[PDB]
Write a protein that binds this ligand. Structure first.
Ligand SMILES: *Cc1c(COP(=O)(O)O)cnc(C)c1O
Ligand SMILES: *Cc1c(COP(=O)(O)O)cnc(C)c1O
Lengths: 402, 402
């Protein structure tokens, strides 16, 4: 079945030394390492198939245009969209959410309306809605957290009303690892006539995602967290909404100095300038690589690795964990009264890469009354030995610093 | 001493066959091929140095952050900016111009003002200004063309008045190869208190560019036309202007659900989300590669190649050329009454890649009373033998089709 030894052999960076020690990279939630299959797919495109892709007549350009559109089709099958034309290539999740907030938001949210977010959102799924509610005179409502890191689902009937136009909600928390009950939340939102955008940047690498089963109206994720290149992400929009969305800024179609400007049809309408064809080719290879391993195989390995880490972390004195027992992907923690950045600095000195800080989720930190947390990511190429290095390191820090 | 043979050996795509014949890639103005040094720099980053850059403290993240900031410094020296912090990493020229129009334009162009562009502008340097003039109620004024493809410089003094806020002008036309007299135009604009944005997307690969000597207020170009990766470009803004530009839509600094949002300072203010670190590393390698060849050496070789091409094209019956005698980089043409797309399709049969259509410059096409043109690019890796194949192919099409 799944062999972590064979998976690790695909990732050249895992041989790196840091501070003279073999790297234990526990920060895939910030960005994932890339297998050779992804790196080489992008390089081979540049070495042998590169051209511009904007309606070029010559053979190299026509073949490159086909490669790009085949990646759009592969991505649409990956999330089980009904049509490839429901997918927009964006620069990343941040840009995809802002695109919805401006194109769809400015045309559908008006004075007196409200938008619902949650207290656990990444800043990228808060600020565009704060700005939009400021542009039009709408109200931003917030689903509160429970101490265990889940959302208070029972507050949703009170927060929704006939003026709620959109729920913007994370699939999986980037700090807590919480997987939100999207199917139930989407059912409730649609009864009030609201749309639902799902921030899926921390979900698509952990298990299969089916946007038709979810029935979400928008879904966004980032290529670089899905073992792929930087500078590329995917925005999915239901065709009925996407074909109605007005232009934002293969996007400009015609220009006249006397008659004005027209724009191309969606999804190309929202892909201005020159595509990041290199990143698109690499992203396609990342989807092929993940699919070849099998997302259910990945989910089982990662779930068993998480269970091992949580059981082992019970032997660390004065450790505080944040989030639910059934967390996906990440473990958020603090050690005693020590500053998160000090804990992170000692772990780095032991060759272990974790992330410390507010993790672009300051309202979440405020809820737990801390300035920062440490966060360890446990991805499909991580091992028991790396978990053991984390646990023994935390025990070592507690012994030395009290 | 420039050797085209030594240069061509660095570009693996040039060994490609198209339609069974050795490739003659005459479309670098659409997008440039990349040397192995650029492809490998990006791949080596992914293989051995990859991490997130958003102020991560662990060793790999700190090192990746330093690599990105070293590229910003290298790019600032490449265009002779005063400070590396005058440069913003943008997705491309299209996005860079829109950034200026939305942050600077919305704060400096008001009802009753005017903006001046030219009739030869790329759509990306037209539409942002058309839409801004509609958001605020300003007038868009246009420098007309001459038959030889130069701008009517003598009309500028009457187009400028005390209400002119900005001149947006191309350094080198992407269709005609006209190099505009920026020194005179910038001197005139500044006498009226206007700022100047220069679209330099077709200039920076052909000769040295010095933004202090030009004294332009904004300068923008694209990485993929400068032998670099897709998905990355550069926006230069004078420091005094850049630090006054407000945010539009590391960019988010702090988020509070009760107190609102703050943003980072420029240039980072205008780099939202996750940087395209792969493309930045490759862009750095492209600047190194070009600087090692020498832009004055590149300019000399390309000018002699252009002179040879224009002399040889005189032997083609029914050939119409568009543009001035001292064109840079590109030759725009049509053959008899034949459709440009048909000419390009036949050349593609001979293994020759040219671009056809309106080249994102429909007002230019309308001036010449044609729907489209063919465009051959003559870059630093092109040769006399490729020119000869273009000439022979055009002669063949004229013989076959009339
Ligand atoms: C990383 C992340 C984002 C931002 O994604 P970018 O690709 O950096 O724009 C948004 N939401 C979540 C949950 C994330 O983990
Ligand atoms: C290519 C080009 C643009 C657009 O640049 P992108 O990287 O595609 O955004 C704008 N202006 C000129 C003159 C160009 O040649």
């Amino acid at each position: 079945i799944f062999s972590v030894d064979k998976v690790r052999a695909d990732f050249p960076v895992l041989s790196r030394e840091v501070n003279g020690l073999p790297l234990a990279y526990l920060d895939s939630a910030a960005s994932a390492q890339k297998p050779s299959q992804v790196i080489d797919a992008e390089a081979e495109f540049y070495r042998h198939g590169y051209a511009a892709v904007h309606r070029g007549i010559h053979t190299l350009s026509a073949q490159a245009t086909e490669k790009m559109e085949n990646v759009r089709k592969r991505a649409s099958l990956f999330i089980n969209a009904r049509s490839a034309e429901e997918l927009v290539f964006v620069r990343g999740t941040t840009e995809g959410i802002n695109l919805v907030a401006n194109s769809w938001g400015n045309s559908n949210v008006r004075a007196g309306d409200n938008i619902i977010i949650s207290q656990m959102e990444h800043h990228a799924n808060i600020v565009p809605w704060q700005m939009l509610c400021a542009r039009v005179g709408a109200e931003l409502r917030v689903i509160p957290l429970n101490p265990d890191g889940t959302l208070q689902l029972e507050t949703l009937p009170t927060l929704f009303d006939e003026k709620t136009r959109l729920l913007a909600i994370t699939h999986v928390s980037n700090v807590l690892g919480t997987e939100n009950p999207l199917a139930e939340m989407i059912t409730l939102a649609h009864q009030h006539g609201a749309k639902v955008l799902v921030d899926g940047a921390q979900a698509v690498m952990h298990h299969p995602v089916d946007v038709q089963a979810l029935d979400c109206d928008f879904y966004v994720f980032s290529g670089h967290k899905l073992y792929g290149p930087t500078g590329i992400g995917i925005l999915y929009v239901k065709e009925a909404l996407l074909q109605e969305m007005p232009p934002w800024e293969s996007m400009i179609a015609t220009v006249s100095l006397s008659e004005g400007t027209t724009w191309t049809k969606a999804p190309w309408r929202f892909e201005a300038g020159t595509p990041n064809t290199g990143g698109i080719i690499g992203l396609g290879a990342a989807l092929e690589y993940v699919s070849a391993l099998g997302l259910n195989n990945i989910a089982e390995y990662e779930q068993n690795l998480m269970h091992y880490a949580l059981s082992q972390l019970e032997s660390v004195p004065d450790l505080t964990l944040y989030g639910p027992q059934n967390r996906l992907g990440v473990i958020a923690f603090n050690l005693g009264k020590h500053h998160a950045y000090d804990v992170g600095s000692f772990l780095d000195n032991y060759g272990i890469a974790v992330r410390t800080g507010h993790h672009c989720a300051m309202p979440l930190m405020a809820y737990y009354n801390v300035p920062a947390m440490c966060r360890a990511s446990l991805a499909m190429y991580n091992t028991h030995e790396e978990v053991d290095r984390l646990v023994t390191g935390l025990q070592r820090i507690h012994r030395l610093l009290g």
